């Protein structure tokens, strides 16, 4: 299998929130 | 308990580094929830994952 499946999730929710908070 | 097991392809490549346990303490803090959103009540911890990471792009 690939590497990271939920990976981009964890990223871009964590930049997002990075914007957000 | 309900935990991550933290030997997951490059989901354990950010439970690694200066950061490492940031990840431990916000997915754990989201896992333990499941409200609606990443961490809607946790969001602190992942402040402090940003706060971390933000010094450190490829250091470790």
């Given at each position: 299998?690939?590497?990271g499946?939920?990976?981009?999730?964890?990223?871009?929710?964590?930049?997002?929130?990075?914007?957000?908070? | 308990?309900?935990?991550?097991?933290?030997?997951?392809?490059?989901?354990?490549?950010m439970?690694?580094?200066?950061?490492?346990?940031?990840?431990?303490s916000?997915?754990?803090?989201?896992?333990?929830?499941?409200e609606?959103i990443?961490?809607?009540?946790?969001?602190?911890?992942?402040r402090?994952?940003?706060?971390?990471?933000?010094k450190?792009?490829?250091?470790?």
């Amino acid at each position: 299998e690939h590497c990271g499946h939920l990976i981009e999730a964890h990223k871009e929710s964590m930049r997002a929130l990075g914007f957000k908070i | 308990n309900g935990n991550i097991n933290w030997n997951s392809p490059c989901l354990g490549g950010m439970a690694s580094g200066p950061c490492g346990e940031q990840f431990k303490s916000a997915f754990s803090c989201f896992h333990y929830s499941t409200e609606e959103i990443k961490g809607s009540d946790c969001v602190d911890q992942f402040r402090a994952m940003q706060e971390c990471m933000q010094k450190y792009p490829d250091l470790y």
